[PDB]
Structure 1
Amino acid sequence: MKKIEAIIRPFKLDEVKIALVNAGIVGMTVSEVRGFGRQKGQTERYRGSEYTVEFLQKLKLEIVVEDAQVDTVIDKIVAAARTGENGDGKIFVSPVDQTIRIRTGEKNADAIS
């Protein structure tokens, strides 16, 4: 099992969300964050101004899936979230040792099906 954490542009939420639902994702969590991602020598454009290290609003998507579904999920997010301008986002994949469904106590594969 893996956790996929994707930082995306806020306006992209709808476009990304539809891609994931159509791909068969059945659970996801979203939160509001702020961030910077300043590659060397670049500025990020937002509403007609250029930024270096100021924090900009982003959204964090969290999706826990079976290992065999990670690449599909990654591909769907990338294709829907990208624009070609710096600031499009970043995805981090991390291990999940156990998953538990609260209502039933189901575990692991059963809790993500």
Structure 2
Amino acid sequence: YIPDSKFYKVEAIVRPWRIQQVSSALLKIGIRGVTVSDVRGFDKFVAKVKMEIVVKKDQVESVINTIIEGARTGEIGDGKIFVLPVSDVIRVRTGERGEKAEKMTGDM
């Protein structure tokens, strides 16, 4: 990927009713945590949700594929996935940084 980076944010803008399917699919590949927020596409709007996950470079393709598995319906309006370089990941609780900081360690 260009830019090259140790970590990447995978940002998926998908249908709100596909949250659980994407989340469950990610869990199967060891991605235990996703961050979700409400967004609107074009007072007429289309409701979407942004799903954000930060992973190591070697996990990006698996994450993309897994999100598609959960989010795809075959109908126009399935959304888009963006990949952005992440220079650093820090765990607030411990100050751990990098690989020691990327995994989600919240309660299930």
Q: Same fold (TM over 0.5)?
A: yes
What is the match of residue 13 of structure 1? 19
Instruction: Structure 1: give runs of 5+ residues left out of the alignment.
Output: 37-53
What is the match of residue 10 of structure 2? 4
Percent of aligned pairs sharing the same letter: 54
Matched, 1:99 2:89: yes
Moved more, 27-36 or 82-91: 27-36
Q: By how many angstroms is 1:80 displaced?
A: 1.5
What is the match of residue 89 of structure 1? 79
Report how many aligned residue pairs link the two structures: 96
What is the match of residue 31 of structure 1? 37
The structure with the largest strand share of the pair is 1
Residues 12, 50 of structure 2: 8 Å contact kept: yes
Instruction: Structure 2: give runs of 5+ residues left out of the alignment.
Output: 1-6, 104-108
| Whole-angstrom distance in 1 between the partners of 2:61 and 2:32 | 16
Matched, 1:65 2:55: yes
| Whole-angstrom distance in 1 between the partners of 2:31 and 2:62 | 10
Q: Which has more radius of gyration?
A: 1
| Whole-angstrom distance in 2 between the partners of 1:86 and 1:31 | 21
Superposition RMSD in Å: 1.0
| Whole-angstrom distance in 1 between the partners of 2:19 and 2:13 | 10
- 4+ residue segments displaced more than 3 Å: none
| Whole-angstrom distance in 1 between the partners of 2:33 and 2:87 | 18
